[PDB]
Amino acid sequence: EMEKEFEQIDKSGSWAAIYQDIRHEASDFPCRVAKLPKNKNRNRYRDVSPFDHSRIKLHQEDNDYINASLIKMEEAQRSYILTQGPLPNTCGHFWEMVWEQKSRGVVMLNRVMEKGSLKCAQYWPQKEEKEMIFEDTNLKLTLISEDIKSYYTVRQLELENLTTQETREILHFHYTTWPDFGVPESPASFLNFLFKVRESGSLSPEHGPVVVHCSAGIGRSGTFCLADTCLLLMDKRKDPSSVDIKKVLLEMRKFRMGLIQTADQLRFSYLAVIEGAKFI
Ligand SMILES: [Mg+2]
Secondary structure (H helix, E strand, C coil): CHHHHHHHHHHCCCHHHHHHHHHHHCCCCCCHHHHCHHHHHHCCCCCCCCCHHHEEECCCCCCCEEEEEEEEECCCCEEEEEECCCCCCCHHHHHHHHHHHCECEEEECCCCEECCEECCCCCCCCCCCCCEEECCCCEEEEEEEEEECCCEEEEEEEEEECCCCEEEEEEEEEECCCCCCCCCCCCHHHHHHHHHHHHCCCCCCCCECEEEECCCCCCHHHHHHHHHHHHHHHHHCCCHHHCCHHHHHHHHCCCCCCCCCCHHHHHHHHHHHHHHHHHC
16 A cells, blocks of 8 residues: 555655655656747746646747646546746736636646745736736636635636637636645645545546646646546556556656655655545
């Protein structure tokens, strides 16, 4: 079992060593488009770039670049787009990607401000009466409703392509209580949040891939996708104990670098998967 592997790493205090192992084994592919000078103001962090092979291309001829990666998990039959928190100048791009990729849900795992600094542009409208227009990509975004709970908020938004007047309902799942430092004490609220997203259909094959982000779109976002995939595979397989988190993580890392940013995020991911299997 992975509960036994978990208890072993804990008693021997080897989380740091296991995490470094994954870092060393992790795929490395080029990010040539990300690193072009014209795209410098499209990247929040210089050390977080999408691989060319798995990057999400915007459908425009001017500049198709956004810092976003398609993670395609063949066996689990899930896809996810992990991306950075939109910058002041890439909100229109962000919502372009939602539109073009046919996403139903956006999972946001950070607050706009943490540790006294801006981590993310205010990319969605906070009031029904004050809709946003992204002039560069010709999209209108409207808050339709908002349901605030203790650990998360879910918002319904209307995204309209202004060129064609088509509209869609996008669901915004905002986990609002991830601590400024470290990881949650218990994974219970994060699993509950994950189940809410699932229950909405936003992770399902009849929709485009869910868009997941934190500030950089590798740490907390990696945790969400890693836990989700691992749990799905345990449901699907003849032998549930054959699902190795380390292997799933390494497979995900073929599609975007850096997923799971600390040994503590790794530990937490184990905890979340173990507890998730218990409940279900
Ligand atoms: Mg109001």
